[PDB]
mmCIF file of C-alpha atoms and ligand atoms in Angstrom:
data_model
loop_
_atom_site.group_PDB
_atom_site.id
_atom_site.type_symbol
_atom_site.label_atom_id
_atom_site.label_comp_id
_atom_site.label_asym_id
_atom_site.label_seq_id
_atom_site.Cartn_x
_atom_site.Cartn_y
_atom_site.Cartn_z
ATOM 1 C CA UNK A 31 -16.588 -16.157 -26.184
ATOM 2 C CA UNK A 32 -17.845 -17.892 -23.413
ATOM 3 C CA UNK A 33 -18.931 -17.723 -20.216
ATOM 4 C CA UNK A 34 -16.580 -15.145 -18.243
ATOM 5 C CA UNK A 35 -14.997 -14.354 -21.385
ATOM 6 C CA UNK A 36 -13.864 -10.662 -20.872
ATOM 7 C CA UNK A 37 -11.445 -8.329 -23.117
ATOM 8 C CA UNK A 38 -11.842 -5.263 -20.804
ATOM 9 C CA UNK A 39 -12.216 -4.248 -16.782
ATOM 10 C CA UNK A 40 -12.551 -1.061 -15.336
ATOM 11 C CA UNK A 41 -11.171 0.114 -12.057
ATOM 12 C CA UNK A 42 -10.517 3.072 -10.369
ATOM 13 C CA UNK A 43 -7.300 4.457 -8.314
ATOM 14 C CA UNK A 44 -8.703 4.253 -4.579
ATOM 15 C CA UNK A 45 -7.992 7.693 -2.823
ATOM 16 C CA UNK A 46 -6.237 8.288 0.115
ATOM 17 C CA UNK A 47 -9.050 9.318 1.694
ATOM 18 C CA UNK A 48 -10.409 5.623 1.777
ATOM 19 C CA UNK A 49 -8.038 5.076 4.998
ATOM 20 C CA UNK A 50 -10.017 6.910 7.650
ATOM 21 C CA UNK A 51 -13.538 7.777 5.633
ATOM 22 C CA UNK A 52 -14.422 4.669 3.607
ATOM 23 C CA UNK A 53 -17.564 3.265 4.863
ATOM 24 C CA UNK A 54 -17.123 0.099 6.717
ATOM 25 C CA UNK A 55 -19.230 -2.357 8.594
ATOM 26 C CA UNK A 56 -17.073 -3.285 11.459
ATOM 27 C CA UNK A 57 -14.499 -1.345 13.361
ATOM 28 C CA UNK A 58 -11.104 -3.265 12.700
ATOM 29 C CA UNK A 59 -8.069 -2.223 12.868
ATOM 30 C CA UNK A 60 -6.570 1.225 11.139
ATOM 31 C CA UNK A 61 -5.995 0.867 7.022
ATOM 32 C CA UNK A 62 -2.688 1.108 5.899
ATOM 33 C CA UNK A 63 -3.444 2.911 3.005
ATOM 34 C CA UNK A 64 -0.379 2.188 1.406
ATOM 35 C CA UNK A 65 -0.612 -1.189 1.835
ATOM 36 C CA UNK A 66 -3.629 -0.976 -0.222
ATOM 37 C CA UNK A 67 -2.436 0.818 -3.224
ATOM 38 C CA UNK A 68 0.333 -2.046 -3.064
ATOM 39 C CA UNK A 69 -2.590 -4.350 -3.111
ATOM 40 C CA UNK A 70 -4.643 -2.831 -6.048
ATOM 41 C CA UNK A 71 -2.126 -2.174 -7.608
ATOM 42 C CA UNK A 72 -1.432 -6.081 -7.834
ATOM 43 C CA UNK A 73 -5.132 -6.940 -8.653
ATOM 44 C CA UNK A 74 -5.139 -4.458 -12.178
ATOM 45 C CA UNK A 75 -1.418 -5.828 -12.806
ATOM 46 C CA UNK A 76 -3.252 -9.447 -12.718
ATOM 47 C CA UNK A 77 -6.286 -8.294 -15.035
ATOM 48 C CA UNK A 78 -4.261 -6.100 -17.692
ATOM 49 C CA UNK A 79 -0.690 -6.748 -17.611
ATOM 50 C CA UNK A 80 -0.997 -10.836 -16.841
ATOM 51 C CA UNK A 81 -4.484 -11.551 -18.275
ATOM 52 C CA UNK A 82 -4.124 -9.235 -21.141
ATOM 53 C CA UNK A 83 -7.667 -7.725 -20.539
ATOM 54 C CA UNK A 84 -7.657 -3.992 -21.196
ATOM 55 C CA UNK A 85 -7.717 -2.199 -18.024
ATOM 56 C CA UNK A 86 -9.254 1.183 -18.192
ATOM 57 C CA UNK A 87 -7.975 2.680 -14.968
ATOM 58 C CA UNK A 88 -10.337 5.604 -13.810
ATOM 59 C CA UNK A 89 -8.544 8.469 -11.855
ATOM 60 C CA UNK A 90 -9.171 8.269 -7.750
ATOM 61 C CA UNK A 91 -10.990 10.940 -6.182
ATOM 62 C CA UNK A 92 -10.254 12.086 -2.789
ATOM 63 C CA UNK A 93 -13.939 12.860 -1.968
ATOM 64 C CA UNK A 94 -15.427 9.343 -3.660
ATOM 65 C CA UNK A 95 -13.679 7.348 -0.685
ATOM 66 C CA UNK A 96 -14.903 4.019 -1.836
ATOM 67 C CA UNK A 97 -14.402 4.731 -5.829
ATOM 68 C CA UNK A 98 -12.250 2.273 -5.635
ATOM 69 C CA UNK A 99 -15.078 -0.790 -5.379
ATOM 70 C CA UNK A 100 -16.422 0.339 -9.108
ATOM 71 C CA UNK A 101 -18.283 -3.008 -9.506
ATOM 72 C CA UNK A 102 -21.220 -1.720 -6.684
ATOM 73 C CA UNK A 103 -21.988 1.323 -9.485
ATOM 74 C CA UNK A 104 -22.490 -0.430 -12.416
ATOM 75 C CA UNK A 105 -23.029 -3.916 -13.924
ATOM 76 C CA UNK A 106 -22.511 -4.802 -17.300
ATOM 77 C CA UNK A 107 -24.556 -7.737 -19.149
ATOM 78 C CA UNK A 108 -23.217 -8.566 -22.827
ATOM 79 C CA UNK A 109 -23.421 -5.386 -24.570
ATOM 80 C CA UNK A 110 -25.429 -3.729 -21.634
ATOM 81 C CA UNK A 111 -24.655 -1.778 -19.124
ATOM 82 C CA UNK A 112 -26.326 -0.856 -15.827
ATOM 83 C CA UNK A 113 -25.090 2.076 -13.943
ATOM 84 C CA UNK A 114 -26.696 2.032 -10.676
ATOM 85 C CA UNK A 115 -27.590 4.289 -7.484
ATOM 86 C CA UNK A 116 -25.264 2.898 -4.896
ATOM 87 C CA UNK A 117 -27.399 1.824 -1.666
ATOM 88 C CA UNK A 118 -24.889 4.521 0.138
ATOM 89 C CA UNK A 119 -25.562 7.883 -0.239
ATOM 90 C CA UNK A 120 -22.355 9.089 -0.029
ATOM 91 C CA UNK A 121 -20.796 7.195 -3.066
ATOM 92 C CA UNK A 122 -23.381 8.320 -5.510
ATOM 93 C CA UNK A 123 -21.614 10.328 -7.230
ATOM 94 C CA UNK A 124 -19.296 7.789 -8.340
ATOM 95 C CA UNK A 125 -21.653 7.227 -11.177
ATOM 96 C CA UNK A 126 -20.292 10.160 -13.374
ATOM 97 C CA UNK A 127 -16.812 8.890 -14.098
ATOM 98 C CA UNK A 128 -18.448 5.523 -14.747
ATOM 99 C CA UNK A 129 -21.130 6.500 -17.050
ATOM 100 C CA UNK A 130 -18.019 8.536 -18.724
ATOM 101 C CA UNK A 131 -16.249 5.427 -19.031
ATOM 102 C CA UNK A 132 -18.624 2.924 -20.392
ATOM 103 C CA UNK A 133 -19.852 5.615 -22.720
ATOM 104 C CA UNK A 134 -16.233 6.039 -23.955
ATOM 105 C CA UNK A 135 -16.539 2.106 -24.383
ATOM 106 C CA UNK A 136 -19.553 2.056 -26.538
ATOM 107 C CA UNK A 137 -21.565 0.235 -23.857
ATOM 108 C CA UNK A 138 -25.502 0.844 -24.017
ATOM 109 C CA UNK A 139 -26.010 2.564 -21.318
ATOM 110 C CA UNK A 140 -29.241 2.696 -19.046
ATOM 111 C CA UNK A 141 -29.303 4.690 -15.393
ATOM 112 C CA UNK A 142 -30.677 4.173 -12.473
ATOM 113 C CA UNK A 143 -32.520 7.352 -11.445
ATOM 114 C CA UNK A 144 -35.690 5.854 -9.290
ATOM 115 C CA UNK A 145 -35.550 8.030 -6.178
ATOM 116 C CA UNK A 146 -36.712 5.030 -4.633
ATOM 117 C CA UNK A 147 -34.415 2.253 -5.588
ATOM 118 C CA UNK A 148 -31.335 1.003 -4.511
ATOM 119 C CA UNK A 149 -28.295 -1.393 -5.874
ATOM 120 C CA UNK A 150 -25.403 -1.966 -4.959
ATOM 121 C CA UNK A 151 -23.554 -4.228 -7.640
ATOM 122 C CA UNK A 152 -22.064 -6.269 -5.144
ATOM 123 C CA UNK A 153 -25.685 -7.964 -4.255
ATOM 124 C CA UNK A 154 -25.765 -8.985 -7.509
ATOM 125 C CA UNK A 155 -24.744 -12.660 -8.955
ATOM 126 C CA UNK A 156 -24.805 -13.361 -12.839
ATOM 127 C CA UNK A 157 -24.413 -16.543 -13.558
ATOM 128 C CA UNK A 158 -24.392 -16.612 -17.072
ATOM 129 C CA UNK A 159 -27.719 -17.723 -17.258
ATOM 130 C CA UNK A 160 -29.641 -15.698 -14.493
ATOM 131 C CA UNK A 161 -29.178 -13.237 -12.184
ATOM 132 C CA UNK A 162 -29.311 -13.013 -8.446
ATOM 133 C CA UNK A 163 -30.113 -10.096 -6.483
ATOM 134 C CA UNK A 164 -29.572 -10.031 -2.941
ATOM 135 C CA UNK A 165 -32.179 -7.836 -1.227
ATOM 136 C CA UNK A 166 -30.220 -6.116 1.434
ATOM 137 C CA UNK A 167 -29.192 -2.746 3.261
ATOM 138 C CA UNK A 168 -28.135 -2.067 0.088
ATOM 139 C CA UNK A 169 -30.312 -3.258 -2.426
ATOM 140 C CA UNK A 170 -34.092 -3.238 -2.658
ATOM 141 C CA UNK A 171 -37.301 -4.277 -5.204
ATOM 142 C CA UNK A 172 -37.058 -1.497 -7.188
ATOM 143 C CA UNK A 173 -33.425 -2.326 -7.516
ATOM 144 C CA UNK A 174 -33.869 -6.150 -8.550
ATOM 145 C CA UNK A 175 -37.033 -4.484 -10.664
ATOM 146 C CA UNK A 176 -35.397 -2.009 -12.506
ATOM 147 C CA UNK A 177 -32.897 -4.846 -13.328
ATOM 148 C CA UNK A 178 -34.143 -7.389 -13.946
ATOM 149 C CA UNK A 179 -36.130 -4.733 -16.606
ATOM 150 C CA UNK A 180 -32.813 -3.752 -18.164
ATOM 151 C CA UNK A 181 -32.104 -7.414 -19.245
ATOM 152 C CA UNK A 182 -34.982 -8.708 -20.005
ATOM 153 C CA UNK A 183 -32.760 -11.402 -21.430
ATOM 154 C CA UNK A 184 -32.452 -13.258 -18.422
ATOM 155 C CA UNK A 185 -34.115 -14.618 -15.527
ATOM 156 C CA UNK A 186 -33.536 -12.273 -12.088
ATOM 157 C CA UNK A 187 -34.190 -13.708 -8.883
ATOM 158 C CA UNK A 188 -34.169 -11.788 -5.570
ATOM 159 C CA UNK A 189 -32.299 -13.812 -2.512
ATOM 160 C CA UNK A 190 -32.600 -12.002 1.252
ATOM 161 C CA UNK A 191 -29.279 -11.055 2.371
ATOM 162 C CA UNK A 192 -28.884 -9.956 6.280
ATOM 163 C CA UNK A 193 -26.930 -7.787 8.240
ATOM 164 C CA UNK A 194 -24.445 -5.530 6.176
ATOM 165 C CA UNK A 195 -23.226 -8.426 3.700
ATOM 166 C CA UNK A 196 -24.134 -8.539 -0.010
ATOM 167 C CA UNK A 197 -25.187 -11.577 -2.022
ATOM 168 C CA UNK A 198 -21.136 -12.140 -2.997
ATOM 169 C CA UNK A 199 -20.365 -11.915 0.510
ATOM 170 C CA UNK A 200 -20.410 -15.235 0.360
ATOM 171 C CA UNK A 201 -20.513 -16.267 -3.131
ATOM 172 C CA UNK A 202 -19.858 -16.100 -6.972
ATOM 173 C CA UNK A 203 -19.067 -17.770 -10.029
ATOM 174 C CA UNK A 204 -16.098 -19.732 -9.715
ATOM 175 C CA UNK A 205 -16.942 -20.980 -13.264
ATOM 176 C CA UNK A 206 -19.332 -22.565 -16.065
ATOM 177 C CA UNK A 207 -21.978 -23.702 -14.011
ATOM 178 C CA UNK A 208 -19.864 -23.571 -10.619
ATOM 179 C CA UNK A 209 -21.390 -21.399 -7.965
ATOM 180 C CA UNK A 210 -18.147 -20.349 -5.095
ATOM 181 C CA UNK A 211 -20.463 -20.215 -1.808
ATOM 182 C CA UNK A 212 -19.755 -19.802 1.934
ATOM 183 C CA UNK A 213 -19.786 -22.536 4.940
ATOM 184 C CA UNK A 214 -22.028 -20.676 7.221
ATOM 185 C CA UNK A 215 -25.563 -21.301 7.451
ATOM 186 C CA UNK A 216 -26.638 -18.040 6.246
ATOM 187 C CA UNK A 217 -24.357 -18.560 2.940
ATOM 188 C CA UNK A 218 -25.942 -21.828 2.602
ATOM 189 C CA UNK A 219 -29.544 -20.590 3.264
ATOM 190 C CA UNK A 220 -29.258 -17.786 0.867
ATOM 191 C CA UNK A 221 -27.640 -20.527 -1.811
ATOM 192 C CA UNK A 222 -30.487 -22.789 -1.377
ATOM 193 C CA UNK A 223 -32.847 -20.105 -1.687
ATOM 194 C CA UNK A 224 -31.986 -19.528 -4.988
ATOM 195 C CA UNK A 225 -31.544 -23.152 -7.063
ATOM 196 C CA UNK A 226 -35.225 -23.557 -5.772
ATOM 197 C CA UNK A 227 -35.856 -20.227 -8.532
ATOM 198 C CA UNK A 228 -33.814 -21.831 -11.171
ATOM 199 C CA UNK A 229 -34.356 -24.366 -13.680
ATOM 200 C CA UNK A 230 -31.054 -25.756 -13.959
ATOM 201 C CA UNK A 231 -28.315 -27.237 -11.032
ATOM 202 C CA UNK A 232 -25.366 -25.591 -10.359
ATOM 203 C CA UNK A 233 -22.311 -27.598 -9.047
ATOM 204 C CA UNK A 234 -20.984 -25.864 -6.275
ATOM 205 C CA UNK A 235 -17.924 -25.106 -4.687
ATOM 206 C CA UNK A 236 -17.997 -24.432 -0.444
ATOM 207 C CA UNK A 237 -15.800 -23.137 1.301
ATOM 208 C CA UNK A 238 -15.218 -22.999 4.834
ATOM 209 C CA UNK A 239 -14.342 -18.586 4.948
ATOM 210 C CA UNK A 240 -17.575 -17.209 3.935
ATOM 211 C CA UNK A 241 -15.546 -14.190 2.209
ATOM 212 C CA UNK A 242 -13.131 -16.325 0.464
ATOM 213 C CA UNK A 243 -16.094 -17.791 -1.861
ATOM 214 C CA UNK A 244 -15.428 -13.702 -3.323
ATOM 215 C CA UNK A 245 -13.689 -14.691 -5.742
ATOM 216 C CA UNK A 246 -13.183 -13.979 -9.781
ATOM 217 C CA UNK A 247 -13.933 -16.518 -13.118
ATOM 218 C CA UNK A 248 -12.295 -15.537 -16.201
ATOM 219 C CA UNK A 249 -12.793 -17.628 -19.674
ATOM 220 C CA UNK A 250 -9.224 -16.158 -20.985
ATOM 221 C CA UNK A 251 -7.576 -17.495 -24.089
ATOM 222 C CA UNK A 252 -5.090 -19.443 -24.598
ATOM 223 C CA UNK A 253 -5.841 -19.851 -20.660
ATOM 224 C CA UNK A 254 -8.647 -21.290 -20.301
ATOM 225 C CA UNK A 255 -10.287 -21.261 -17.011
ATOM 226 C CA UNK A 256 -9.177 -18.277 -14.855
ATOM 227 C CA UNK A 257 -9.680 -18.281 -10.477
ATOM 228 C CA UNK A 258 -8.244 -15.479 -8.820
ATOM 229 C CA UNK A 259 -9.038 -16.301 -5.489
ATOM 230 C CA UNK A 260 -8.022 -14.983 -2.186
ATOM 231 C CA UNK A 261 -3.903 -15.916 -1.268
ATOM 232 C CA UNK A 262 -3.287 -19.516 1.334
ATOM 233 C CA UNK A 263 -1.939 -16.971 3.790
ATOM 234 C CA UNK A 264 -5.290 -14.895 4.257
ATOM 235 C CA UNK A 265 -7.388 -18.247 3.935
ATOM 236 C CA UNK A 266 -5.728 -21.422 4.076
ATOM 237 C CA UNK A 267 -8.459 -23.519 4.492
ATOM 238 C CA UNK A 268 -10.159 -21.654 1.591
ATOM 239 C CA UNK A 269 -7.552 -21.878 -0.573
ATOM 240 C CA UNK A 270 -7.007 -25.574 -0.015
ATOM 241 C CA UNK A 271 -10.168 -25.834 -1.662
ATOM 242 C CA UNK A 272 -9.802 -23.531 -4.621
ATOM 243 C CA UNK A 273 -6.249 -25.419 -5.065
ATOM 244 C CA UNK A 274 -7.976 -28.757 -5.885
ATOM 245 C CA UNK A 275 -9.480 -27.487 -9.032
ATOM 246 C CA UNK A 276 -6.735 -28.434 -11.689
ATOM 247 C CA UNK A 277 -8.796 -27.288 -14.971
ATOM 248 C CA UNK A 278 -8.344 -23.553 -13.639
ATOM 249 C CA UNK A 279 -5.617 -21.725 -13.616
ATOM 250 C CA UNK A 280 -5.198 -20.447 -9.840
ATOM 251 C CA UNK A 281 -3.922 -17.005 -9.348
ATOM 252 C CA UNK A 282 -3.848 -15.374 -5.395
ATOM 253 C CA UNK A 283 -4.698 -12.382 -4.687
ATOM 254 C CA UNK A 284 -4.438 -10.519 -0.996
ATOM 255 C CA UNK A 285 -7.595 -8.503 -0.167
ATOM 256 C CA UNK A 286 -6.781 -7.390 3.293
ATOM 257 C CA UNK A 287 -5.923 -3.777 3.437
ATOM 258 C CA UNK A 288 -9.370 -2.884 1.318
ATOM 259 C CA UNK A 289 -11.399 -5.655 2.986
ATOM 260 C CA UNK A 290 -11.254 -3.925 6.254
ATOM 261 C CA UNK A 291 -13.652 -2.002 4.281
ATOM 262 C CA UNK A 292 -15.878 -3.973 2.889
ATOM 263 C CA UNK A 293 -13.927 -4.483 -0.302
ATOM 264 C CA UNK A 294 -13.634 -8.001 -1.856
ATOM 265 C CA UNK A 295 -11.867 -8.985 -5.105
ATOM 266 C CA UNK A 296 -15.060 -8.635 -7.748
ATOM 267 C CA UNK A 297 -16.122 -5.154 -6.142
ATOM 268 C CA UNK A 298 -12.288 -3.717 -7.637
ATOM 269 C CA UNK A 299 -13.416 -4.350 -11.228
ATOM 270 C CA UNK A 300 -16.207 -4.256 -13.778
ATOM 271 C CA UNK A 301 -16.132 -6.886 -16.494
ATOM 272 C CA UNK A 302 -16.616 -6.038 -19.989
ATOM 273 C CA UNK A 303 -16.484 -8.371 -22.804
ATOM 274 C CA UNK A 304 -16.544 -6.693 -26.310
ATOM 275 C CA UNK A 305 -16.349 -8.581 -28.487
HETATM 276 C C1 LN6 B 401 -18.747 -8.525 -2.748
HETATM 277 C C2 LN6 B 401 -19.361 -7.212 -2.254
HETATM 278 C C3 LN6 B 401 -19.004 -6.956 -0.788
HETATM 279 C C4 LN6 B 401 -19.642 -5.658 -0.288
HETATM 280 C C5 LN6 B 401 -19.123 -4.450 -1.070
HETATM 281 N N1 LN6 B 401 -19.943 -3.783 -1.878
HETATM 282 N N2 LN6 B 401 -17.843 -4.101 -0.973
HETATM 283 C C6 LN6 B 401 -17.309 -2.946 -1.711
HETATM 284 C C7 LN6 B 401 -17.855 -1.624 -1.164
HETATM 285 C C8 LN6 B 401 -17.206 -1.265 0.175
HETATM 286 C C9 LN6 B 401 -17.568 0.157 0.609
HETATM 287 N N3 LN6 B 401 -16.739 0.544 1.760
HETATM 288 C C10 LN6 B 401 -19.043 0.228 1.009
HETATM 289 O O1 LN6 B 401 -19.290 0.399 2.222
HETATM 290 O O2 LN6 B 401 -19.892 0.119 0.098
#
């Protein structure tokens, strides 16, 4: 059980609502909402039926329009998990069948309640050995604070992330030690930002598409090293790179329908590994 190592994931069915109510930064062009479901659907048959990691599939609700992006509620550390208050107001209440669901999965479970504090999970980057929480529109000190309280196991870090992005905007694990980060000059601000904070150097993978370094590390068995990254035919030149790494095994996934909203491929799931 190493780093990555997972034997569950929770998502939730994304409701038809999403299509015309999901929050979303920029105005692009209209969600095809069936598209989407085609998508998702996809991404849990990847987790559960080809990775073998139980998928617990929470029910979609029409008035949670973003329930579908369950990693921004919750974060789960070892045996820990974190359910926080969403830095939107309107997807607060996505909390309740996620609480329900790590309860049901024996997960020790600690809320956010602080009036005052904000997380979204998306800001935040565990490493295996630290975290980092991106300070944002969505995430604040008491956020990182309340955190970085809940596992006092590891070192938590707090990296300024502009505009409407999250930390894994532009980054995440791409594996043991192996940090997926962004071209721009923002993504490599942020990344600096952080080894500064740490102790130990992380290798790191850049890519040219900012949002392609979203990506997902899995430790699976009789696997090994696990990349689901985003497909050649969203990002080539992203893709390119992720192809080059021959100890993982690469799996595509398209993002496109639920990234018009924001959505990238580790805010679909939440990673548990029980062990
Ligand atoms: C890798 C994280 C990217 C940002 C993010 N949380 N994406 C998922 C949430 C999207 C949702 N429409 C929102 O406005 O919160």
């Amino acid at each position: 059980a190493a780093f990555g190592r997972a034997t569950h994931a929770v998502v939730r069915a994304l409701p038809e609502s999403l299509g015309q109510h999901a929050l979303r930064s920029a105005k692009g062009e209209e969600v095809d909402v069936a598209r989407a479901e085609r998508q998702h659907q996809l991404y849990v048959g990847v987790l559960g039926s080809k990775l073998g990691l139980q998928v617990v599939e929470l029910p979609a609700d029409e008035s949670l329009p973003d329930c579908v992006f369950v990693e921004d509620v919750a974060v789960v550390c070892e045996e820990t998990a974190l359910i926080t208050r969403p830095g939107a107001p309107s997807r607060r209440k996505e909390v309740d069948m996620m609480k329900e669901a790590l309860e049901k999965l024996q997960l020790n479970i600690v809320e956010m309640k602080d009036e005052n504090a904000t997380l979204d999970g998306g800001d935040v980057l565990f490493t295996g050995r630290e975290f980092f929480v991106g300070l944002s529109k969505r995430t604040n000190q008491r956020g990182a604070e309340i955190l970085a309280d809940t596992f006092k196991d590891y070192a938590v870090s707090t990296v300024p992330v502009a505009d409407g992005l999250h930390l894994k905007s532009f980054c995440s694990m791409a594996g043991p030690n192996l940090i997926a980060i962004g071209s721009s000059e923002s993504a490599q601000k942020a990344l600096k930002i952080m080894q500064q904070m740490s102790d130990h150097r992380y290798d790191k993978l850049t890519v040219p598409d900012d949002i392609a370094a979203n990506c997902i590390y899995l430790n699976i068995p009789n696997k090994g090293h696990v990349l689901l990254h985003r497909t050649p035919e969203e990002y080539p030149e992203s893709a390119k790179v992720y192809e080059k790494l021959k100890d993982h095994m690469l799996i595509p996934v398209s993002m496109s329908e639920l990234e018009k909203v924001d959505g990238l491929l580790t805010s679909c799931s939440v990673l548990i590994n029980k062990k």
